[PDB]
Every structure is written in structure tokens, then in C-alpha cells.
Write a protein that binds this ligand. Structure first.
Ligand SMILES: COCCCC[C@@](O)(c1ccccc1-c1ccccc1)[C@@H]1CCCN(C(=O)[C@H]2C[C@@H](N)[C@@H](O)C2)C1
Ligand SMILES: *[C@@H]1O[C@H](CO)[C@@H](O[C@@H]2O[C@H](CO)[C@@H](O)[C@H](O)[C@H]2NC(C)=O)[C@H](O)[C@H]1NC(C)=O
Length: 337
């Protein structure tokens, strides 16, 4: 086909990127994270008890207001590093961009306050493989591919730095392509280790000149769902020591004045060095030697089979425009802009 649709994304604080979808006839809109590290679709359900405050504070899908709704009702449970969500399956039509797909999704009836009380978004749309879908539900992208409408069986992500401007575009995703308004040059493509996970090999991780980490190779997941770059607790501890970074209950910090002179961090992928300066990795609120500044890196030990792995989140994606290629099982990187 020729279709290459686009969805605009909202950037909240540089930690949440999300966009709109519509479910049903007439369409009920939701804000969703597009997550390459998961494969399922869910939104909150009108059936969610208001005993869950998250279901109070977020938008709820009402099956009964939709003509295209088809009952299934099979129980679903989804696990994330943080929250666990529960519900049942429903089928309805979902619009992304200009594309309309009949999809199977979870309607969530149990949403914990941690973490969804902290979400600026309603639900998630997983962009991962069926291999990782809970319940073996066909994921939304596969269904689109089935539709046979995209130009190329790929999708791409642009993530932006948060701006004060109203005009400024927080993010964009493209279905079936990439937008070259947002990258310079040509893509460098790295093959997936295997189909079913958006994960690739990483040669090393460098703090400065010296090759400190993942020195004998490691794994890299390219995760649009993730805010920060993540590594193993061991990998991260050492990298953090290398920066003189300090550990706090939620985050890693440096004195706000010392951030600019921190060493670059390079990720070696596909034979090329992908480099983030401290300007990419410190949230520099002030430059006071008196204040402490957050780094956008943290530890997350992701268990097997996917882990241990690094996850390359928005901190990375902000620098590098990312093309996810379903046909060729490759991920492409280009310089964002
Ligand atoms: C760029 O947009 C980021 C959106 C926010 C992601 C997130 O920051 C978040 C913040 C506040 C409330 C909820 C959630 C959140 C929680 C669960 C699922 C989706 C979003 C997540 C915090 C927990 C760890 N981290 C992930 O493991 C990630 C791993 C990834 N695969 C996802 O499934 C979750 C990201
Ligand atoms: C909801 O989806 C489930 C899971 O895909 C359906 O269960 C399957 O239905 C087919 C076709 O009738 C059976 O042959 C399979 O063996 C079933 N799978 C399992 C795991 O039980 C279910 O039928 C659908 N429900 C409704 C109400 O439409």
C-alpha cells in the first residue's frame, strides 16, 4: 500500500511521551504510551471500581457506548517492572493516525496508584512482538500489517526535548516510515538478535576514553516505553561511581554545577559509537553547586528471558531517531532533529 500515517506525541517533563488513540464507534479517545518493550494494548475500563483512584483520575473505556464492540471477557493480567494491571479482553476498532484496525485489547479493572496515579497517560499500546504478548493476543502492529496498507512494514519514533513553547512538537510516531524532517543523514541499521524482541547486541559502554562496561558485550533493548536509560544494577553502580554520582531514594544525582563537565557516555552498537554528552543526560535545573541534579539513567534489572539487558529509553531516543523495522528485523538509528 501507500499509507504512511503519523501520530503526534506529547512530552511531559521529558519522562512521558504519549499520543492519542480512539476506541469504538463513536471513538473514545485515550492517551497511550507507545511501548516497544511490551506487546499488549490496554486502557482503563468503565468497569474499574473507583476504589482505584487511578480509574478515577484517568479516562475510562465504556463498551456499551460503542457499536463496534465485541465481547470476549477473558481475563488478562499484565506485569511491568512497576505496576501490575488486570482486566479482561474486548474487541473494538482502534484508530491510530489514519489507520483503523480491529483490535483485541485489555480493559483494565484493577489499576494501582503506584504507578498510574503518576501517569499523565491513560493506557499503553505495546509495539512489541507477539512472542511477548500476554495471552498470545495479536499485537496492534501485526494487525495493521495484515491490513496491507503501509508503504513499508516499519515504524519510527521521534522524541523531543521539552519546551516552554506551545508550538514545539513533543514527539512523533510514524506508521510505515520515517519522517526526514526529524533526522539527518541516513540510517545505520542493526539487526535484531532474534525476532520477537526489539533487542540488539551491544559491544561496550564507555565512560570517556576508557571502556568501562559491557566490555565483553551485552544486550540492548530499544524501549520507547522507558524514560531513562537502564542497566544492570552492577553495570549502573560502576558507571555511577565513574561519574561521582550519588544515590538517593528515587534517583541518581550530581551537584547541579558539576554536570556539564561530566564525561560522555558512549554506547557501542552496530560497530559505531553512539554518544551522549552530559547535556543529553543531566536534567540541569540550575547550575548551583548547592543543588543536586538528576541523571536520566537508573538501574533496572530485567529478568530472563529478556534480561539481563540495557534498555535504551527516551534519554537515548531523544538523540537518535529510531526506525523499527518489522520486515527486515532491524533497528535503524539516525541523528534526531
Ligand atoms: C517515554 O514514555 C515513558 C512513559 C512513562 C514510563 C514510566 O516512566 C512511567 C511513569 C509514570 C507512570 C507510569 C509509567 C509506566 C509504568 C508501567 C508501564 C508504562 C508506563 C515507567 C516507570 C517504571 C519503569 N519504566 C518501565 O519499566 C517502562 C519499560 C517500558 N517497556 C514500559 O513498559 C514501562 C518506565
Ligand atoms: C475470546 O478469545 C479467546 C482466546 O483467543 C477465544 O477462545 C478460543 O476460541 C477458539 C474459536 O472458537 C477456540 O477454538 C480456541 O480453542 C479458544 N482458545 C482458548 C485458549 O480457549 C474465545 O472464543 C473468544 N471469546 C468470545 C466470546 O468471542
Amino acid at each position: 500500500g501507500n499509507t504512511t500515517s503519523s501520530v503526534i506525541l506529547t512530552n511531559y517533563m521529558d519522562t512521558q511521551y504519549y499520543g492519542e488513540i480512539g476506541i469504538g464507534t463513536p471513538p473514545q479517545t485515550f492517551k497511550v504510551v507507545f511501548d516497544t518493550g511490551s506487546s499488549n494494548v490496554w486502557v482503563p475500563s468503565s468497569k474499574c471500581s473507583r476504589l482505584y483512584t487511578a480509574c478515577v483520575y484517568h479516562k475510562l473505556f465504556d463498551a456499551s457506548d460503542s457499536s463496534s464492540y465485541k465481547h470476549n471477557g477473558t481475563e488478562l493480567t499484565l506485569r511491568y517492572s512497576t505496576g501490575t494491571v488486570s482486566g479482561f479482553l474486548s474487541q473494538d476498532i482502534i484508530t491510530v493516525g489514519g489507520i483503523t484496525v480491529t483490535q483485541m485489547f485489555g480493559e483494565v479493572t484493577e489499576m494501582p496508584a503506584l504507578p498510574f496515579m503518576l501517569a499523565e497517560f491513560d493506557g499503553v499500546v505495546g509495539m512489541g512482538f507477539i512472542e511477548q504478548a500476554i495471552g498470545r493476543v495479536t499485537p496492534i502492529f501485526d494487525n495493521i500489517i495484515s491490513q496491507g496498507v503501509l508503504k513499508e512494514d516499519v515504524f519510527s519514533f521521534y522524541y523531543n526535548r521539552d519546551s516552554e513553547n506551545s508550538q514545539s512538537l513533543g514527539g512523533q510516531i510514524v506508521l510505515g516510515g520515517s519522517d526526514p524532517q526529524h533526522y539527518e543523514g541516513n540510517f545505520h541499521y542493526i539487526n535484531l538478535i532474534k525476532t520477537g524482541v526489539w533487542q540488539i547486541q551491544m559491544k561496550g559502554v564507555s565512560v570517556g576514553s576508557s571502556t568501562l562496561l559491557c566490555e565483553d558485550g551485552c544486550l540492548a533493548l530499544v524501549d520507547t516505553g522507558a524514560s531513562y536509560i537502564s542497566g544492570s544494577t552492577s553495570s549502573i553502580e560502576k558507571l555511577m561511581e565513574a561519574l561521582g554520582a550519588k544515590k538517593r531514594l528515587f534517583d541518581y544525582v550530581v551537584k547541579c554545577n558539576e554536570g556539564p563537565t561530566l564525561p560522555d557516555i558512549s554506547f557501542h552498537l552496530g560497530g559505531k559509537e553512539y554518544t551522549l554528552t552530559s547535556a543529553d543526560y543531566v536534567f540541569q535545573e540550575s547550575y548551583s553547586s548547592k543543588k543536586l541534579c538528576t541523571l536520566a539513567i537508573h538501574a533496572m534489572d530485567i529478568p530472563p528471558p529478556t534480561g539481563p539487558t540495557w534498555a535504551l529509553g527516551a534519554t537515548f531516543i531523544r538523540k537518535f531517531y529510531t526506525e523499527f523495522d518489522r520486515r527486515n528485523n532491524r533497528i535503524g538509528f539516525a541523528l534526531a532533529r
